[PDB]
Amino acid sequence: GCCSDPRCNMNNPDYC
């Protein structure tokens, strides 16, 4: 999953 993107992280904590 996104490991370098906080936007992705914020929206989907299931990814990395």
Coordinates of all heavy atoms in Angstrom, one line a residue:
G1 N 0.8 -1.2 0.0 CA 0.0 0.0 0.0 C 0.9 1.2 0.0 O 2.1 1.1 -0.1
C2 N 0.2 2.4 0.1 CA 1.0 3.7 0.1 C 1.8 3.8 1.4 O 1.2 3.8 2.4 CB 0.0 4.8 0.0 SG -1.4 4.6 -1.1
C3 N 3.1 3.9 1.2 CA 3.9 4.0 2.4 C 4.7 5.3 2.5 O 5.4 5.6 3.4 CB 4.9 2.8 2.5 SG 4.2 1.1 2.7
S4 N 4.5 6.1 1.5 CA 5.2 7.4 1.4 C 4.1 8.5 1.2 O 4.5 9.6 0.9 CB 6.1 7.3 0.3 OG 7.0 6.2 0.3
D5 N 2.9 8.2 1.3 CA 1.9 9.2 1.1 C 0.9 9.3 2.3 O 0.2 8.3 2.6 CB 1.1 8.9 -0.2 CG 0.1 9.9 -0.5 OD1 0.4 11.0 -1.1 OD2 -1.1 9.7 -0.1
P6 N 0.9 10.4 2.9 CA 0.1 10.7 4.1 C -1.4 10.8 3.8 O -2.3 10.6 4.6 CB 0.6 12.0 4.7 CG 1.2 12.7 3.5 CD 1.7 11.6 2.6
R7 N -1.7 11.2 2.5 CA -3.1 11.4 2.1 C -3.8 10.0 2.0 O -4.9 9.9 2.5 CB -3.0 12.0 0.7 CG -2.3 13.3 0.6 CD -2.1 13.8 -0.8 NE -1.3 12.9 -1.7 CZ -1.2 13.0 -3.0 NH1 -1.8 14.0 -3.7 NH2 -0.5 12.1 -3.6
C8 N -3.1 9.1 1.5 CA -3.5 7.7 1.4 C -3.6 7.1 2.8 O -4.6 6.5 3.1 CB -2.5 6.9 0.6 SG -3.0 5.2 0.1
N9 N -2.6 7.4 3.6 CA -2.5 7.0 5.0 C -3.7 7.5 5.8 O -4.4 6.7 6.6 CB -1.2 7.5 5.6 CG -1.0 7.1 7.0 OD1 -1.5 7.6 8.0 ND2 -0.1 6.1 7.2
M10 N -4.0 8.7 5.7 CA -5.1 9.4 6.4 C -6.4 8.8 6.0 O -7.3 8.6 6.8 CB -5.1 10.9 6.1 CG -6.1 11.7 6.9 SD -6.0 13.5 6.6 CE -7.3 14.0 7.7
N11 N -6.6 8.6 4.7 CA -7.9 8.1 4.2 C -8.1 6.6 4.5 O -9.2 6.2 4.9 CB -8.1 8.4 2.7 CG -8.5 9.9 2.5 OD1 -9.7 10.2 2.4 ND2 -7.6 10.7 2.3
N12 N -7.1 5.9 4.3 CA -7.1 4.5 4.5 C -6.0 4.0 5.3 O -4.9 3.7 4.8 CB -7.2 3.7 3.1 CG -8.5 3.9 2.4 OD1 -9.6 4.0 3.0 ND2 -8.4 3.8 1.1
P13 N -6.2 3.9 6.6 CA -5.1 3.4 7.6 C -4.8 2.0 7.4 O -3.8 1.4 8.0 CB -5.7 3.7 8.9 CG -7.2 3.7 8.8 CD -7.4 4.1 7.3
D14 N -5.5 1.3 6.6 CA -5.3 -0.1 6.3 C -4.2 -0.3 5.4 O -3.7 -1.4 5.2 CB -6.6 -0.8 5.6 CG -7.7 -0.9 6.6 OD1 -7.7 -1.9 7.3 OD2 -8.6 -0.1 6.5
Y15 N -3.7 0.7 4.8 CA -2.6 0.6 3.9 C -1.3 1.3 4.5 O -1.2 2.5 4.5 CB -2.9 1.1 2.5 CG -3.9 0.2 1.8 CD1 -5.2 0.5 1.6 CD2 -3.4 -1.0 1.3 CE1 -6.1 -0.3 1.0 CE2 -4.3 -1.9 0.7 CZ -5.6 -1.6 0.5 OH -6.4 -2.5 -0.1
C16 N -0.5 0.4 5.0 CA 0.8 0.7 5.5 C 0.8 1.6 6.7 O 1.0 2.8 6.6 CB 1.7 1.3 4.3 SG 3.5 1.1 4.6

